[PDB]
Amino acid sequence: TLSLANYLAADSAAEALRRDVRAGLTAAPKSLPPKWFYDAVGSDLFDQITRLPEYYPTRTEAQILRTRSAEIIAAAGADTLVELGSGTSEKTRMLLDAMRDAELLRRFIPFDVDAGVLRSAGAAIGAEYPGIEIDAVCGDFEEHLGKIPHVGRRLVVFLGSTIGNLTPAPRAEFLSTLADTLQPGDSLLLGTDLVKDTGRLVRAYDDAAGVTAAFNRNVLAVVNRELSADFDLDAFEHVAKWNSDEERIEMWLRARTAQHVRVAALDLEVDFAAGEEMLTEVSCKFRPENVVAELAEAGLRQTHWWTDPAGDFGLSLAVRLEHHHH
């Protein structure tokens, strides 16, 4: 059967956006949070990015998961699959199939901000896996991870490389809170994109076809639409950079010429100097030894680590850290 629990108010997304745009556009170094990339148009654009020859991470993680699903499912011994976030719905069915092959599959708990997607995905999954209990939760990572039911033995998965879109401090915060929801017996599956040739990294975030550029610019269309702003999308250049000290990709929008922007819903007048850059996304890249340390600091012990043949990407399986005090 299907059960949906919807914790987001009608104006949750609207109020969150007003705050983020006002905070981002009036900071001395302008920025916009990457989460606003993903309206209908942006999610479609991102979907296309996953099939771009330069953008390897989605396909590499998918290929690792394809190969390791049975082993992940054996390792976890879990009967309940909890999926955190979007865009991983084909990867979801790899894990669900593996759990069904193992005769363990009982419960599926998707957690995402879009209730409509959950209702659709829940009806579909429910049909493809007769007898499964689907407890869908519509909420956000900030506030609602606690709302995920602790029924059964749970494999909690967070795929799609979203973890790297958080800088070290909010990332440490997120992982720790995630770890806190795990009961003994539960496992966390986590994908991390690895440090590699910087040419490859930059091209992945600035493809030859210019799709990533459109995806970046689209966040301006979102602000235009939702807050009645007058960004001139054609006035902003897409810039992807390798930050070697932070070992992360950065995406920027750079004003070709001086721009004056009014966000009418906010009664906010904003100025861009010619060449001024606005930060729209970071994509942190990891070293294998650093993934274990970060997991440890969050209260997790890595029990498995899998990579693709090129060492481009790693999947971790982790469990609650052991403590023996004296």
Name residues whose C-beta falls within 8 Å of residue 87's C-beta, 6 or more positions apart in sequence: 43, 46, 47, 50, 58, 160
Domain that holds residue 105: 1-10+56-196+286-326
- Is 312 marked as binding a ligand? no
- Identity of the amino acid at 186: D
Structure tokens at 298: 């969050």
Round to whole Å and give the CA distance between 221 and 281: 16
Q: Is 141 annotated as a binding residue?
A: yes
- Judge if 147 and 24 occupy the same domain: no
Return phi, psi of residue 268, to 5°.
-125, 120
* 71's tokens: 């082993």
Residue 234 is labelled as binding a ligand: no
Q: What is the resolution of this structure in A?
A: 2.0
Residue 139 buriedness (CB in 10 A; 0-12 / 13-18 / 19+)? buried
Determine if residue 271 is labeled as part of a ligand binding site: no
Number of independent structural domains in the chain: 2
| CATH number of 182's domain | 3.40.50.150
Q: Which two tokens mark 237?
A: 């250049």
| 243 known member of a binding site | no
Paired tokens of 28: 């001395």
Tell me if 140 is assigned to a ligand binding site: yes
Gap between the Cα atoms of 125 and 315, Å rounded: 24
Q: Method used for this model? A: X-ray
CB-based contact 187:304 (threshold 8 Å): no
Could you tell me if 119 and 212 lie in one domain? no
85 annotated among ligand-binding-site residues: yes
**263: which strand partners?**
229, 268
Do 4 and 64 fall into the same domain? yes
Q: Is 196 annotated as a binding residue?
A: no
* 129 assigned ligand-binding residue: no
Chain centre distance of CA 237: 24
Tokens of 9: 């108010």
Instruction: Give the DSSP H/E element, type plus range, for residue 278.
Output: strand 277-284
- Length reported for the chain: 326
Asked whether residue 91 is marked as a ligand-binding residue, the answer is yes
The DSSP secondary-structure symbol of 299 reads T
β partners of residue 52? none
Q: Is 222 exposed, middle or buried (0-12, 13-18, 19+ CB in 10 A)?
A: buried
The end-to-end CA distance of the chain, in Å, is 48
